[PDB]
Design a protein around this ligand. Structure first.
Ligand SMILES: [Mg+2]
Ligand SMILES: [Mg+2]
Ligand SMILES: [Mg+2]
Ligand SMILES: [Mg+2]
Ligand SMILES: [Mg+2]
Ligand SMILES: [Mg+2]
Ligand SMILES: [Mg+2]
Ligand SMILES: [Mg+2]
Ligand SMILES: [Mg+2]
Ligand SMILES: [Mg+2]
Ligand SMILES: [Mg+2]
Ligand SMILES: [Mg+2]
Lengths: 143, 143, 143, 143, 143, 143, 143, 143
C-alpha cells in the first residue's frame, strides 16, 4: 500500500560464501529498491549497540560473536510494504522452519548462522536504519 | 597468479534498472570477493575529481553528466588476477562489440550508458580505489 | 469467580487497520463489559510513563516509538475473572505462538505490532487502569 | 467525494446489550474511520444541552430520560461522504421501516430505543461533534 | 520533609462568589504547586461516588446536594508536607473555629458552605486524587 | 455590552513561578468569570495546532518550544465585553510597552515569556475555546 | 539539568577564514563536549534536504547557495542544557543584534553570513543530528 | 615553499579534556588549513592497522590500548611546508623536552599521553592520510 524502508543485513556467513549478489537479486526481483548500502566489519560495541534489545537474552553473546566474526553488508531497501515483503522473502528466522524459495531456506545453515537480517516492524526499521545511516546518505532514485 | 584489487562502479543506468544484485552475482560466480562497497550519488565535483585525467578531453562534460544523473554503487573486488578477470566479465567497453554473457552485453544500452566501470590496470586500480575508499574502510575476509 | 477490571489497549496497528469494532466484539461475546473507553494519541512522555517499568530495557525506545506512532484506544473491561479471561482471548504475546481464534492470531502482524495489550495481573491492572482513568470516568452499568 | 466527519452515539440500549463492537465493526466495514471515541454517562443537563433544539417538543422528556438511563459511547467517524454513508448503514430511524443489514434493523427494539444516533447533515455534524469533543481531542490517523 | 500530593476542591459557594484566584494565590504563597486542575459540575452520582464512605451517615444527602449545586474546581497540590500544610492554610473545618488568615476564616459562611476541601491524610489523598484524576493527567513541573 | 467568552492561557513561565492564583484573581476582580479550566502539558503537535496561523513566521519554532517547555493552564473566561476586557487587563503583548497594573507589566520577563495569552477577537476566541474545550465541558454558573 | 545533544554547523564563511578552532574552543570552554564532527562540502541537494521545511520561503535559494559555497564543519555537541546553552554562546541570529562575546558578534559579517548554525529545540536537534549522522557514528566519551 | 598535506590526530587524552578547539586554533594561527576532519573511536584493528610499522615493538600494545581508549579527531592539514611546520607547533614527542608554546608543552601529561600526532615526513603523510581518508572526502577551499 504505502512506500516503506527497511534495513537488510547480509550476515558474515553469507558474505564469506559470496552470496551477496544472489541475495540482492532476490530483493530486486521482488520489487524492492536498494537505496543505501555499505560493507562494514562491526566491532563488539557496534554489534552490542545494534542488538541492545536482546542484551538480557541467553543467545546475546553468540549473536554478537557471530555478527563480529566477519564483514557484513548493511542496506536500506525501499518499496511498497517493504518491511513485511522483505520478511516474506527472508522466510522464518529458523531455516528448518522456513518456506522453500526464501533466503533462510536457500542460504542459511542454522538458527545462529541464518544468512540475513531484516527489520521486524516499521518502528524497528526506523531505529535500525538510523543506527547505520544518516538520512543524508540515503540515495533516492532520480533518473 | 597473485591476489589483486580492482574498483567496480555500477553506473546510474544499471542502478536505476535494479541490476545491482545480478551484476554482483556475476563477480562472485567468477571468484571475485567484494571487500568494500557503498552506494553514493556523486556531485559534479566528485565525478570531475574521479575523471580528472580526462578534464581536457571533449567527452568529459557528457561523462560527468551521466555519472551524476543518479546513484552509483562503488566497490572494491579482490581476487587472483582481479583486474583482468573483472575486465573479462565486464566485456568490451562498447556493448555492441561485447561477448555474450558479459555485463556490457546483457545490461548496457549504448557506449555512454554501459552499465559498469572496471579499473584498466593495477596502477589505475590503486588510484581509483584510493579515490573512493580509505584503507581503513576496506574489509578483508576474516571468517 | 469474582468480578474484576482490566485494562485493554488497541494498539496503533489495529487502529490504523480499523479493527476496533471486531476486537471489541470478541471481548463482549466472551462476557466482558466495556465500562470505560477513549481514543488517545499518546505523547512520548505519556507512553514512557505507562511503560516506566521497562525504562532500562533495550527495546524501550522501539516500544515507545510504536505506541506513539498513531492513536490508540484505551478501555476498562469488567467481568468474572476479567484479567485472565481477557488474556485468554488476546492469546500469546507472540502471534506465531497464539491459539486460533485469539486477537493476536487474527490481527497481529508480528511480536512488536501485536494488535493489543491486556493487563497481566490484578495488581498490574489496578495500576494500569489508574494511569489512564480517574475512578469518576468509569461508567458502571445501570439500565 | 470529499472527506467528512459525523457524530455517532451508541445509545444506552445497545451499550447495555453489549453491541458496541458489532456496531463499530459495521462502521469500519463500510470504510468509516473512528477518529475519536469516549464512553460517558450523560446527566440530565448534558442530554438536554445536546437535544436543546427539541426542548419544546412533546417527546423531549422521554428522549432525555432514555439517553440518561445508562452509559453511551460517543464517537467521531471520518470518511468520504461520511454523513450520508453513516446514515445509510444506520438505516431508517424507525426500525420496523429499516432496510435489512442496517443497525436499526439488527439492533433496535423500537423507535424510542433505536440503538444509535447519527448526525443528519454536515452542519448538524459540526455542531454535534463540537458539543462532545474539543478539536484537540480528535485523533487524525498518522500511521 | 518529603514531597506529597493532596486534593483541593474549591466548593460551589467559593466558585459562585469568584474566589478561585484568591484561594489559589494562598496555596501558591505557602509554597504549594498546582500540578493538576479542572473545573467540573458534579452530577449526583459523581458526588455520591466521591463521598461513598459516608453513604450511611445522616449528613450524606445534604453534602451531595450542596456539592452538586454548582461547579467546583478540583486540583492536585504538590509540595513538602503538602497534606498538613494545605490543612493549615484551610484552617478548621468549622469557620467560626478557624484561625485568622485561613481560607475558612476569610471565605466560608458556615460549616456546610465552608469554601474548600482538603485531603485529611496521605492515604485519603491517594484515594481522592485517583477519584478525579488519571495519573497521566497530572503535570509535573519540568521548568 | 453583550456577554462573551474568551480563552486564557497561563503560560509555562507564570505556572513555573506559581502565579496562577494571582493572575486568576485579577480576572475575577475585573468581573470576568472562570467557566472552564484545566492544566495541560502541550505536546509539539498540540501547540503547533493551536498556533497554526503563525506556521510560516520566523518566531514559530521558539513559540512552540516555549509553550511546550512546561505545563500551562487553559481557561474560558465569561463576561461583558470579555475579549477586550481580558486584553486590557493582560496589557500590551510586549511587557516593556505594557501599562502598570497589567499582567504583562507585573509577571512577564520578556516578549517571548510574557506570562499569559488572551484571544485577540471574538472569532479567534470561538476557534481557540473549541480547540481546547468541548461545549459540554463548559460549566455555566447555576448558583 | 538533563544531558542533551544539539547540531552545530560552522558555516562556509567561518571555515574560509579559518575560525574553526576558535569557535570550537568557545563551545568547550562553556562545558559542551564534541561527540561527533566532520568536514563536508554540501551539494545543492544535501542543503535543500537539510532546510526542507523552508522550501517555500523567499530566503530558501539564498540560504542554499550560501551553505553550498564552500566546505562546512558539522558537529554534535553534548552537555547539560546543550540546546539552549549552544544558542546562548552563538548569540542572536542577526549579528548586529547579538550579545558581545558570542559567535555571531565576533565572527559573523551579516545575517546571511552568520558564521554558525545551532539547533533551535530538542525536537529540531534530533532531526538535524539524524540528517548528518548515523547513531553508530556518534562517539560517546569513555576514558 | 610548496603546499603540502599532513595528518593530525588529536589523541584521546586531549579529546577527553576538551582541548580540540584550542589545538585546532594553534594550527590555524600558524597558517595551516583544515581540509578534512572527523571524530572516530578506533577499534583494535583500526589502530593496529594505522600503527602497523611498530607491530613488532615492545610499546605496540600500550600504544594501541591508549589510542583505542576514547574517541580521537583525525584531520588533514594543508599549507606551505605543512609537514615540518605542523611538527614545529607540536613540539618534541616527549613533553618534558618540548619547547614552550608547543602543543606537547601545553597539553601533554606524559610521553604516552602526549595530546597529538603529526606525520613525520611527506611519505608517511601520504600513507597516513590515505589510511583515514578517501581522496573524495578531502575538501579543498573554494570561496
Ligand atoms: Mg523489534
Ligand atoms: Mg545527500
Ligand atoms: Mg578498519
Ligand atoms: Mg508483569
Ligand atoms: Mg462519574
Ligand atoms: Mg491533540
Ligand atoms: Mg447540616
Ligand atoms: Mg501525561
Ligand atoms: Mg486572530
Ligand atoms: Mg455538561
Ligand atoms: Mg556506538
Ligand atoms: Mg568529494
Amino acid at each position: 500500500m504505502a512506500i516503506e524502508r527497511t534495513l537488510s543485513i547480509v550476515k558474515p556467513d553469507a558474505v564469506s560464501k559470496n552470496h551477496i549478489g544472489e541475495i540482492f537479486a532476490r530483493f530486486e526481483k521482488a520489487g524492492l529498491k536498494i537505496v543505501a548500502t555499505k560493507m562494514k566489519h562491526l566491532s563488539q560495541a557496534d554489534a552490542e549497540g545494534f542488538y541492545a534489545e536482546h542484551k538480557e537474552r541467553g543467545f546475546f553473546g553468540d549473536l554478537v560473536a557471530f555478527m563480529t566474526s566477519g564483514p557484513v553488508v548493511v542496506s536500506v531497501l525501499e518499496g511498497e510494504n517493504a518491511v513485511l515483503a522483505h520478511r516474506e522473502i527472508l522466510g522464518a528466522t529458523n531455516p528448518k522452519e522456513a518456506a522453500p524459495g526464501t533466503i533462510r531456506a536457500d542460504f542459511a545453515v542454522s538458527i545462529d548462522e541464518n544468512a540475513a537480517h531484516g527489520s521486524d516492524s516499521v518502528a524497528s526499521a526506523e531505529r535500525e536504519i538510523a543506527y547505520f545511516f544518516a538520512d543524508n546518505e540515503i540515495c533516492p532514485r532520480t533518473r
